[PDB]
Design a protein around this ligand. Structure first.
Ligand SMILES: O=c1ccn([C@@H]2O[C@H](COP(=O)(O)OP(=O)(O)O)[C@@H](O)[C@H]2O)c(=O)[nH]1
Ligand SMILES: O=c1ccn([C@@H]2O[C@H](COP(=O)(O)OP(=O)(O)O)[C@@H](O)[C@H]2O)c(=O)[nH]1
Ligand SMILES: O=P(O)(O)OC[C@@H]1O[C@@H](O)[C@H](O)[C@H](O)[C@H]1O
Ligand SMILES: O=P(O)(O)OC[C@@H]1O[C@@H](O)[C@H](O)[C@H](O)[C@H]1O
Ligand SMILES: OC[C@H]1O[C@H](O)[C@H](O)[C@@H](O)[C@@H]1O
Ligand SMILES: OC[C@H]1O[C@H](O)[C@H](O)[C@@H](O)[C@@H]1O
Lengths: 590, 590
């Protein structure tokens, strides 16, 4: 098996997660005949990969057959023990002969990549290197086994045509997880779901680009022995646009972390929410005028797509929910996070300063705490109950007064934790300042935009993504166009209720698998049969309905949402890959 | 309402718990017309009671009507906010005229108490004082209301005859929670449950005593307007021995502590089990040759009755389970606690020394821990990953070696944490040394006898009873004769599976309230239709079956057992007291 892809060592939301979750089961069920191919980027990928430059059995012949011939191929383990013997390929090591590879592409399939975008050039170069490695392996192994080559996305789709030109006896499977042409039309301010058969692919390809990419994608789909897509909705645009109906639907699964107790995810949520509460206390210093027990943490994560990931409708719903909470005289407050990576330069002074003063207050309270504890210990040793007024003197009251005065703040807490280099052109900040949300005292919702992926080694918010998601209360992902949707998937795996859409692969998958959804925390939101304003109103209604329920109802809802983890497990969802491999073997050679 | 009883301020297992749990609901449903009467003992009862010597409304007339007349009456709150206005009565303050009270008893009902036992003399004196207080209150209040007087046990049963002699217009309810004659015959090595109608009460009363007590109990039962008992099994011996069928059965409830989350009792169990693990590490120092993750904590609590609370059968079952675990080659180990108060003098040196060396090892590990943390912090500040061998020098290895040598122990850990003044006559230690259980390395079960009630301010085991019970895994109470049974009741309230009996009020109550018991953690054990050896074999089978199930099964079983807390709630079980009060009002005056 060869699961060649571009995201194996570099962290990107797509491809990387599905491969990392699949590797364990796909290796334990099959064995050491599982091989993974990907690129090399000088970004720290070697930190997570245990490279094996020295010769190693289980395809030891290529190391002394081709490595010392002007190429660069490594063998790694990934630090994940699913037996993922990964074949890492360097991109910049072999780039001096791009002209001959372009000529080879011209001879074979009249395709290639223009010099405008280096991403696709690197993808094609990696495809050439992968094809050379696979051919060398077949030559060295005397063609005794019939290996199956599987391809993900267009970043590794040139392998299909390269192998078909050379007629290598392998079973070809191609699985596209996102028709990028659909992605770039859905961002073109044009309706995409009302009609699909009225699109002219060649006319649209090129004004927004995606002409060579579309051509190579369709060539791979046609020439691949087995074609596959993520959701049933994915197959719909695949057969209507690429004119190649997928052989079988292959829903995306996850490696659920089973605990010895059913309620351990609740404890993880409690701890992570405590950490988020510490961050909130840091950010809203001098403005802690709202109860923190009535605070709910909403969030929308993923790549920074405004109209595709559904951030405009979420912000409109947040403004409306703020208006209803203000006019209803409610003590509930909602802190909404926005984890969408936009380029910054560093943090702003306000956020780091807020964390600093929060922990300075923590230190001052600690000091008074040890002094009080020592005096109380003396009193208990003597045998007299404290009268509570003889312990604290004038100096510690003086320093508490000084600390309180130092934390006084007149400006409002910032909406962005980082210092972005383009604030006049950022959609999120623009609409935030348009809808009049500035974390004010009167505001019932507080927006925090964290334009960066979460990491466990960050100066502020020392939580990785999974822990932070476990800490939140509701994940709102009203995405207009996205094939499957991972973020709601692990939200429901970790027990957090989520707001999906009927235009999403996750929402569609959970639509017909459960009778009466939204009773299990899956607030499916209709975006196909409703206008934008109606969808915003429905999102506001869903948010308010989540707000009105008490703590017991929230706990019960989280339990019900967690109970659905078995649907997205790779044990249940891995059978489709096995079926695809069986069809590929039957088509190529029994 | 007057709930007069002997255990209101002094801590005894019976009476005290039921009154303390009932007070909240019986005061919130009725109001400030609820009055509680009890004795005064110079044992610290005033620490838990906020006495009000100064005049206070809501029966302010007695304070300036009778208190300054040679008596001693206080008003208290109990520190429990169920509105329990308690009328505390001093016992030793008014004891100079016992002869006239004895003559009054002779004139009224030919009863009294012989000078052999001072407990019953104090009870009768308290009854006289209570009757005087009630009569003075009626005189001062102009008899406007028709108050209801309720009596518990024979320690407050002279009030019935004293009030009937004076014909005070009150509604009399008497509730006996234990027919003491049954208790003392069941300890006389004679069968009690095979027949009940063949007993001669007068012949049996006096050789074991309980003649005056039996006479006054039956006089109270006959003269009381409403008679009541704890369980249905209680009414059975009440009508067959006292010849006064109770008007209605009144099962004993509990004030369940509801948490905002369903699983919080699991977290409490985890924390309490961690504390018990610390105690076990202290006790078994130099002998930690068994995995602590495979350790299950069984316990049997309550008053020190050997054949009545079922301690002999539990120890036989423990020995048998040890034999099966040894011959089965099992890694599971079981630590069985015995909380039965027997008089001691202090702790023994071994147990305190064991706790001391445990925490000395904790301190040594802590010291090495700070040194390692500082060196690691230096390494991380520099920027170099530790090589793990340059940090620890020779001195800290030297002190770890010295600490390890100091904790070496050749004698086995003791079975009793305290130093009892009669070890040659203690039934528990006698049978423990007979069945050959000495906490050896080969022994799969380890017995710890803690001859004292648990307290939160003890030098070792700083846990109160409820926390310790939450920490255990299974409460075994194979009691032969006991009317209702509180310990399994709060074991099931707090989620711990329990082993009750069909001769118990709790076991009988749960028998016909749930279809197919032992599926909810209620291991009902038959002791009526089975011999002693067969009962021991069934207990051994139950213990082994509990041992074989894994952690997930234990968690599920605890959840199921916790789900039954609503059956024993005072909300559901308090209706019988309301019915009894209604019948008393109907019988006395509508
Ligand atoms: O702060 C973040 C936000 C998102 N993700 C990852 O990004 C993926 C989102 O994938 P999705 O299919 O939702 O959309 P994509 O971002 O791939 O377009 C999830 O798997 C997350 O694990 C992350 O690692 N850190
Ligand atoms: O270490 C202990 C052991 C027992 N109990 C109390 O003793 C009572 C046991 O009552 P039960 O009806 O089981 O028997 P009794 O001891 O009254 O005969 C329970 O309510 C416990 O709260 C306690 O407070 N501490
Ligand atoms: O954050 P909330 O919705 O109020 O949930 C409250 C918390 O949920 C879970 O983490 C646990 O059950 C906690 O014990 C509980 O306090
Ligand atoms: O002591 P056990 O029977 O092994 O139960 C194990 C513990 O039970 C509960 O206290 C919690 O669920 C803990 O998370 C779990 O570790
Ligand atoms: O469909 C699988 C997932 O990965 C894809 O590459 C897309 O980035 C994402 O939106 C999709 O949900
Ligand atoms: O019946 C109520 C409870 O209190 C009684 O006084 C007994 O001490 C106890 O065994 C009984 O279970």
């Amino acid at each position: 098996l060869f699961e060649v892809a571009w995201e194996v060592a570099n962290k990107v939301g797509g491809i990387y997660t599905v491969l990392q979750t699949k590797a364990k089961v796909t290796g334990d069920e099959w064995g050491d005949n599982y091989f993974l191919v990907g690129p090399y980027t000088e970004q720290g990928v070697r930190t997570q990969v245990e490279l094996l430059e020295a010769p190693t059995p289980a395809l030891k012949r290529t190391l002394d057959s081709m490595n010392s011939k002007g190429c660069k191929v490594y063998f790694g383990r990934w630090l994940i023990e699913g037996g993922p013997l990964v074949v890492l390929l360097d991109v910049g090591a072999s780039a001096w002969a791009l002209e001959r590879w372009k000529g080879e592409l011209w001879d074979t399939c009249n395709i290639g990549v223009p010099w405008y975008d280096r991403e696709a050039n690197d993808a094609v170069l990696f495809g050439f290197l992968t094809t050379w490695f696979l051919g060398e392996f077949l030559a060295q192994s005397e063609e005794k086994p019939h290996v199956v080559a599987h391809f993900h996305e267009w970043l590794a789709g040139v392998g299909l045509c390269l192998c078909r030109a050379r007629r290598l006896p392998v079973a070809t499977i191609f699985t596209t997880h996102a028709t990028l042409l659909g992605r770039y039309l859905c961002a073109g301010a044009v309706d995409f779901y009302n009609n699909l058969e009225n699109f002219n692919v060649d006319k649209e390809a090129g004004e927004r680009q995606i002409y060579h990419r579309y051509c190579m994608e369709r060539a791979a789909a046609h020439c691949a022995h087995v074609f596959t897509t993520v959701s049933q909705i994915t197959a719909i645009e695949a057969q209507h646009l690429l004119k190649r109906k997928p052989d079988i639907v292959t829903p995306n699964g996850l490696n659920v972390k089973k605990f010895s107790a059913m309620h351990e995810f609740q404890n993880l949520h409690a701890q992570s929410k405590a950490r988020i509460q510490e961050f909130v206390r840091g950010h809203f210093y001098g403005h802690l005028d709202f109860n923190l027990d009535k605070t709910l943490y909403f969030f929308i994560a993923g790549r920074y797509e405004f109209s595709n990931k559904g951030a405009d409708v979420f912000l409109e719903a947040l403004a409306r929910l703020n208006y209803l909470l203000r006019v209803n005289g409610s003590e509930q407050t909602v802190v909404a996070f926005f984890i969408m990576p936009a380029r910054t330069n560093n943090f702003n002074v306000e956020t780091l300063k807020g964390q600093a003063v929060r922990k300075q207050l923590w230190d001052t309270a600690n000091t008074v705490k040890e002094k009080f504890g020592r005096k109380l210990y003396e009193s208990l040793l003597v045998g007299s109950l404290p009268d509570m007024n003889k312990m604290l003197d004038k100096e510690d009251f003086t320093m508490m007064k000084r600390a309180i005065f130092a934390t006084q703040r007149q400006s409002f807490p910032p909406v962005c934790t980082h210092n972005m280099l383009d604030d006049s052109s950022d959609p999120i900040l623009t609409t935030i300042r348009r809808i009049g949300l500035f974390n004010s005292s009167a505001d019932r919702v507080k927006v925090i935009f964290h334009p960066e992926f979460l990491s466990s080694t960050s100066p502020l918010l020392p939580v990785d993504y999974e822990e932070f998601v476990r800490g939140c209360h509701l994940g709102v992902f009203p995405s207009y166009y996205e094939p499957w949707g991972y973020t709601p998937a692990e939200c429901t795996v970790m027990g957090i209720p989520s707001i999906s859409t009927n235009l999403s692969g996750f929402g569609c998958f959970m639509e017909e698998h459960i009778a009466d959804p939204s009773a299990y925390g899956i607030y499916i939101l209709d975006r196909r049969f409703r206008s934008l304003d109606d969808s915003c109103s429905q999102l506001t209604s869903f948010l308010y309905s989540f707000c009105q329920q008490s703590r017991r109802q929230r706990i019960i809802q989280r339990n019900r949402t967690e109970r659905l983890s078995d649907l997205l497990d790779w044990k249940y969802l891995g059978r489709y890959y096995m079926s695809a491999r069986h069809m590929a073997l039957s088509k190529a050679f029994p």
